[PDB]
């Protein structure tokens, strides 16, 4: 079930943006991303994390032809990792956990076998100077429809922050906070 803070993204789509303060853009050797979701779409971007202007570095969580996947870049190539064995756009709740460690990565859904990716060509290590976490895919032209919950990225429980009106968060379009239980 949808755990913690939760948002519905509906018809038309919307977007939740976190902006690090200018002087506090982190650079990491390793990344941990986890998010609960539910949707029936074939195509959508759920979470995208971008490095500042002038750098190519990015990390993107998306659904392509029904399957959840991450694609990322740290100076070298685009690296894709995907759970290709099971459609995940069946409208039920699923958790996806992503790990990055240099150019290598892992991905796990609910509790299916862990998927490992090791780019055969050697990659750089650092996600440089992270500037924004964008949630909802509205910008990248592939807007999410459904529920997102329990977003975790490198310490930052980004959905809870939005619910607490963190000064560094901006919410736009058809995005609504799910209330609490009785």
UniProtKB/Swiss-Prot annotation:
Subcellular localization(s) per the UniProt record: Presynaptic cell membrane
Presence of keyword Protein biosynthesis: no
Tissue specificity as recorded in UniProt: Brain.
One GO process term, biological-process aspect: angiogenesis
Any one GO molecular function term: acetylcholine receptor binding
One GO CC term on file: presynaptic active zone membrane
Superkingdom field: Eukaryota
Family designation: Belongs to the neurexin family.
Subunit-level organization: The cytoplasmic C-terminal region binds to CASK. Binds NLGN1, NLGN2 and NLGN3, DAG1 (alpha-dystroglycan) and alpha-latrotoxin. Binding to neuroligins is calcium-dependent, and the binding preference ranks as follow: NLGN1 > NLGN4 >> NLGN3 > NLGN2. Interacts with CBLN2 and more weakly with CBLN4. Interacts with CBLN1; interaction is CBLN1 hexamer form-dependent; CBLN1-binding is calcium-independent; isoform 1b does not interact with CBLN1. Interacts with CLSTN3.
Protein name: Neurexin-1-beta
Native species: Rattus norvegicus
GN (gene name): Nrxn1
Portion held of the full protein: 81 to 292 of 468
